[PDB]
Amino acid sequence: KQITVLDLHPGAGKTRRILPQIIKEAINRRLRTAVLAPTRVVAAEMAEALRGLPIRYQTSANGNEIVDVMCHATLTHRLMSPHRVPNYNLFVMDEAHFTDPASIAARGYISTRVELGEAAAIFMTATPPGTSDPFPESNAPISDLQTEIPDRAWNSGYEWITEYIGKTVWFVPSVKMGNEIALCLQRAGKKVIQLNRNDDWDFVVTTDISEMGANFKASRVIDSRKSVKPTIITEGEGRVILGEPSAVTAASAAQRRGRTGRNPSQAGDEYCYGGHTNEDDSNCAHWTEARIMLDNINMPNGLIAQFYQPEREKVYTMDGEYRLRGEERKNFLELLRTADLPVWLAYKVAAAGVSYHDRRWCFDGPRTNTILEDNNEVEVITKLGERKILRPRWIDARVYSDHQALKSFKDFASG
Secondary structure (H helix, E strand, C coil), rough: CEEEEEECCCCCCCCHHHHHHHHHHHHHCCEEEEEEEEEEHHHHHHHCCCCCCCCCCCCCCCCCCCCCEEEHHHHHHHHHCCCCCCCEEEEEEECCCCCHHHHHHHHHHHHHHHHHHCCCEEEECCCEECCCCCCCCCCCCCCCEEECCCCCCCCCCCCCHCCCCCEEECCCHHHHHHHHHHHHHCCCCCEEECCCCCCCEEEEHHHHHHHHCCCCCCEEECCCEECEEEEEECCCCCEECCCCCCCCCCHHHHHCCCCCCCCCCCCCCEEEEEECCCCCCCCEHHHHHHHHHHHHCHHHHHCCCCCCCCHHHHHCCCCCCCCCHHHHHHHHHHHHHHCCCHHHHHHHHHHHHCCCCCCCHHHCCCCHCCCEECCCCCEECCCCCCCCEECCCCHHHHHCCCHHHHHHHHHHHHC
């Protein structure tokens, strides 16, 4: 009948205490449950916590077993595929604030099904999509201090950063600015861990809390309040850039501040941020990619799934705009898992009528679409073929912008 939101503020007792109780009572009522988690870590956190109950933990390809434990991306990938889906009665989502394309899509699927009367849902999150309060309430008091935060290294000044004793989580605008800041701290004789994709330490430097960061005591969060995020350009034929670090959503800032001030015994925890938040996200590729996914989901009675209401003002297309029909849906799916291509790109490709094996498109593009390795056109040798420079018909900054990523796109254009 309804979608329920547990605004359970930070403090890692959610999986520990409450989850098994929800599921435990979800089993006596004989309800078909899907438990949805945003990462492998968390979905393995949920394994360790649900010891003793009937559970099918799945990566997913009557009897007694009635609940499933899976990643958001697993649900959507099955929903998109032409294979059966369990008719769930209950959906329970952990960290329902994730703006990953699949998680926005899965959140929409569920939202349509509750509105259809088909099921019930529990969303778990500190910062429910819709909310824009950067300073949420929490267990322990947090000291909020806006001061200037270095974007790079620094010789002297910011004497507060290093003079401080304790442990610190630094959220940095980008992965490359991480390196610098990190080295800088190391030179000051500070023990630092970088994490992008041991115990005795002073600093953790993060791109985002999605990777790692689970139950690790710190006393200070240094927050640059920026992050790099893929954007779509309208004109051209479509394009995705990975642009200069921009302002984060307040919900996103909330989640970072969330790392500190959750231990009632420790009262002098603090949060130093520089820069304000920005709610305008419309231009972020992730929404469009989410919409492409839900468009390509088959639903009862011929309907197209709508977005979760709070998130409906982010997409400008209407429903079924990105629908793929026939052999196209197949090529699309092929390029998602096997090829490991971003949803935008896979769609662009598949929708144009090209096939999973026709690697031509990565070469017959305009002069301006030439991918630069250092600042030089890349050489890629094909299957005993020619010397053709990489020049794709569609540019998506994701597939080369990161050094490991380029090799695999190279390995993709090869065969």
